[PDB]
Point group: D2
Chain length 354, copies 4
């Protein structure tokens, strides 16, 4: 592969409502965001049906739950600015409609919830730097001015909280390596300088926390295999060496922590089916990749239900949304086969970065 | 000690608001519930001042955050029934005032949030059985009728979610041993039979989840030392043997999981000071107890701030509330000395069980 | 129990030959040491038959393999001095007969192999202090003079190597607590002062190393339950708190590390049957005790065969030696039932310490 | 690199004597084996001086300690047959001189000690299959006839015991992948079929056991980085996926388990200096490679001293043997700088496999 490739992304963004019902957000052929939700917080639930938000959008939507349980969606508009819309009350299907946050956006938006309850949004700006904007009070439609964190980005940003409440942001840099920058005090506008984690990545970075607190980062490497790196101390400075796992993947990875505390990674494999690998013991070795039947046309998007069961969403060859899930709350559970969440077809609205 | 002793309890109940500010609830000499909160979600924050809820109460208050971020407090009233009051909006100091849930209550109330967003309350009833009542919709003032789970209780109940979303309830039985009962499917009114975990306990049980998912239970034993037992499988049936730790304790324990994923336990020690022990490695051996300066007159109540720092509340010999906290987000952090949260004096309103 | 009780000991000492065949040493009704060995290094092997060493002895024999593979046995003689005899070549049943090491001995002897290949023997002397004597060259019948390490002993000593090659010795002191003393440099006559590990023990201490390097010590406590303590650092100074396991035991424990690296403990239980407990995960919680059919009249002595399978020796009610073993090299293996190693009856020749 | 490359090997074979003194074996410019030993079992000991064994050899020597403590060396002779010579007594510098074992050898010999005390030798034969021969009684100069295990080898074989006593042998196959074959019962001539572990390796395999029992295998991969794979069950069939570590290495790796039970790997790095990586926690992530000053001309050979301290041997640019070691028995110890073990120069006598 080209060292500047960005692997295929997931086709929807997912969130858990305040009652843990899953709700998915995607872009249809009308260039509008449509959403659909479980009617009860279990993977075998029926889904409500696809519902449209009026308005044309020009990026993949990002969704996050506010600290008062209301979902809020962020998306680039036809004016290349940032727009958002929110549930007006937790677990209710009444939304505010799109409202402006301005700026000039050249990536998909990324959203993170600070540990003091304030949402914060990260984007690549018109100068290819990292910019951000935040709620000035928890779960309130009152936002800061736009501010730059500098750098040069060549991927979408990925943000995650450290165990001590400090946001850390990861992104590919101008040298195609993974860089990162972090708050030096929790939920405060005081940030480090940019630092390189060195390698070469060919996907957006994917970040998860392990049970020990520590962040782990997953990405596709230059040889098209999964690689990963982890924090080895109590700060954002001390990291392991990179490790790669054998097996060519053809999409971004998606990572999840199962209810036994072990990590699992899902990715589209070299044969265009869904592949899965899991840690066999704590911090442990990784299993050989296992394959699920069925050709898929996007990266997976992963979520967990109220009972811990993992559920995976993909685009099918018919350009509709399919999903499968674990049959039991159990690391060795069998899985269902792909089922259709029918009613619309989806397009990949991800911002083209070059 | 007597095998039917119940060790001294904590003097306040604490919760984190939606923005993670700590808020404490206690009973003053007027037999009313008073509360106080941090003005910002950090341990060195100033506190707002003690504010009264009108109404006379006859138990320790229990508090839990709803899935929409609103705090809700439960307490026994002068009529021996259950009463509750709630924040009318997340992170706001406007409350509903006490509203009735009826029933007949002979213990302190215990509250648990189901993984489908519904609060559920557990109490000992007038027949000494375990009774419960629940929200019929997530974060809504719409409640079920009272229902019995049977048994015979001689302690307050303690409830916790398993990793798969099933509530499990622990309580001392008529033989002074620890018993438990559990949902057999997550957030459903389908329950097991009562089963004994065998020993003899002389405090209320204290339950926490470890990073591996598994529940761990802590209690004082018949020889006045801390003992503990843990789940060793993926279900509620398979448990370890009990282990005891040397050192006489003179209150209920309080347990917390620090931001490195290790467990710590706090208790009033044999010299009436606060003692602390921590796991030195994963699942590991426990440290010798360490002592903090200062005589204390209750069990500790423990909480974590937005930046991970642990904070401990106790009754002082002056009958006021004192607290101390970690200076840094770090397992080996030093601690502050006791500081006063002045303005009222507190009484122990715990229901007397015999 | 009395705080100065010493629990019942094992009836034989066992060693692995250079080819890993098990060989057992015990004292018969003629007050002579007799031995018997496997004919091949597997638990289902036939045994050779009981063979006598000429000479009357007055303690339990201790056996250790030299660094050149020759077994060597140590025992107190009718003159209260230390005697030894050795295989004249590895894996051969030709022995030297008893030869004198003099001194005055008031405990059973304890033997440890230094990491420079020299045997070293620890005993309580006529002044109740700890004394020792060592080979001055590896696997050579050339010994030092007797030297005192001081202290006051009220149990037999137990010695074990730390991971860095320093011998550490454990023994009950005059206050019935567990004390210890250690080499400050590996395989050198340079020793620490005595230090207390505090509790009260009612058996000889039993010491094993875990996979992490660290020593763990097991003993019966004042309430007749198993207790244990472990090193938590890289030196001999830093230890955990003591923990107890529920369940009354009526003999010394015996500990072994199974081939998955987890610890298992065997002891005679409160019903006079053999009980077993194992660590369920690394450093983990301990299982409930499991019982084997059959009344036993000594503590267990445990060993491992060439294929990893655990084998347990006990005195039966007929005063003969019985054993059972794992059917497969596997932590969850089933076990055989007791089988007789017939031909002599055994007596407990342990030195009476008070 | 070429997929059929075999990376540069270590220049000496090392063993611990019965008293744990290190002794090294290498080939000098006269094509004879010379050896040198520590005079005391500590890394700062003086060495005795280089001593010659008479006889011309045509492979790297392999050395193993017998179960009676006597070292024994194996080497290919001028007739392409296998020869051996042994210490006539443990810890003594009197040797038997070279004695014939016949056969026809096309690799370096590899030696393994069965858990019943019998040495067993593995070689590639004249038909490129794996052949072996064994002692028919423990630590005795009585050997079996040569027997074939089949296969097709394109590297030297590497043998290691599983925790249950079964020998397992690893070697590169005709497809440049790593293959293996194993005893199906401990120390018995009953073997599995050959099975592939799949990848492509460009060094001999290096095998070590972890504390959990399980084997781990390290090799250089097709992209010249270190890769590794581990057993994930209790048998020889169940393995993890392969993982690679970033960093180009230019020699075979050498692995050792330090006294805290963690693995460390040493290799010549891309800048021709010695590099080291270690596991930061159990099973854990690996550290970034650290470099030692000094250009080296072979792979490292690693050993541990009687006090646990790691010591590393390499060929220097002057064609002599150099070594360095840890200053303390401690995972975070500093290291010495290279010191010369002077008196002869060494050649790489490894059999050229293509
Ligand atoms: C998402 C928003 O939808 C509106 O209808 C458009 O007019 C805005 O430019 C923006 O794209
Ligand atoms: C997000 C920011 O919006 C502003 O309007 C621009 O001037 C910046 O370059 C950046 O794109
Ligand atoms: C993953 C899905 O598998 C199914 O069999 C197909 O019918 C869909 O188009 C989709 O590709
Ligand atoms: C908490 C409630 O306060 C009210 O004022 C009382 O009248 C009720 O009985 C109840 O105790
Ligand atoms: C909580 C329950 O309230 C009801 O009114 C009573 O009849 C029950 O015994 C129980 O006390
Ligand atoms: C824990 C507290 O320590 C302080 O020194 C005392 O003044 C208080 O009364 C309280 O007992
Ligand atoms: C073990 C030794 O056996 C000999 O026969 C005795 O004469 C010695 O005193 C000693 O007891
Ligand atoms: C083992 C030692 O033997 C010597 O002969 C005695 O004088 C000492 O007290 C001690 O008993
Ligand atoms: C442990 C053994 O169990 C057997 O059944 C008995 O016959 C023996 O006497 C011995 O007590
Ligand atoms: C190692 C042996 O040395 C002897 O001197 C030679 O004659 C043999 O062929 C063999 O090489
Ligand atoms: C080691 C074996 O030696 C024998 O003499 C040969 O016939 C075989 O091919 C093999 O090389
Ligand atoms: C590793 C060694 O480092 C030293 O500085 C050099 O003098 C030697 O030749 C050798 O290369």
């Amino acid at each position: 592969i080209e060292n500047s490739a960005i692997a295929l992304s997931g086709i929807v963004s997912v969130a858990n409502n305040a009652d843990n019902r899953l709700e998915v957000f995607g872009v249809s052929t009308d260039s509008a965001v449509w959403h659909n939700w479980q009617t009860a917080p279990l993977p075998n639930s029926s889904w409500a049906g696809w519902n449209k938000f009026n308005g044309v959008v020009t990026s993949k939507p990002a969704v996050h739950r506010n600290s008062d349980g209301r979902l809020e969606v962020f998306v680039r508009g036809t004016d290349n600015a940032l727009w958002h819309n929110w549930q007006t009350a937790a677990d209710t299907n009444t939304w505010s409609s799109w409202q402006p946050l301005y700026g000039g956006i050249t990536s998909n938006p990324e959203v993170c919830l600070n540990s003091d309850g304030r949402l914060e949004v990260f984007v690549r700006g018109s100068d290819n730097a990292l910019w951000h904007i935040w709620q000035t009070a928890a779960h309130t439609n009152s936002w800061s001015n736009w501010k730059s964190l500098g750098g040069t980005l060549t991927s979408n940003p990925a943000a995650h909280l450290n165990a001590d409440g400090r946001i850390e942001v990861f992104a590919r840099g101008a040298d195609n390596a993974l860089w990162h920058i972090w708050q030096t005090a929790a939920h405060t506008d005081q940030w480090s300088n940019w630092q390189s984690l060195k390698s070469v990545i060919t996907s957006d970075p994917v970040v998860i926390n392990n049970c020990d607190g520590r962040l782990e980062v997953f990405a596709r490497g230059a040889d098209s295999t999964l690689r990963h790196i982890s924090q080895i101390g109590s700060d954002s400075v001390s990291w392991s060496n990179w490790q790669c796992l054998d097996g060519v993947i053809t999409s971004a990875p998606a990572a999840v922590k199962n209810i036994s505390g072990q990590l699992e990674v899902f990715a589209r494999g070299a044969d265009n089916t869904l592949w899965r690998t899991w840690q066999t013991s704590h911090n442990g070795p990784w299993s050989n990749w296992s394959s699920f039947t069925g050709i898929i046309a996007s990266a997976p998007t992963v979520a967990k239900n109220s009972d811990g069961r993992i559920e995976v969403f993909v685009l099918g060859l018919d350009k509709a949304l399919w999903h499968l899930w674990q049959t039991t709350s159990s690391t060795t559970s069998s899985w269902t086969t792909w089922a259709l969440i029918g009613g619309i077809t989806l397009i990949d609205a991800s911002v083209i970065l070059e």
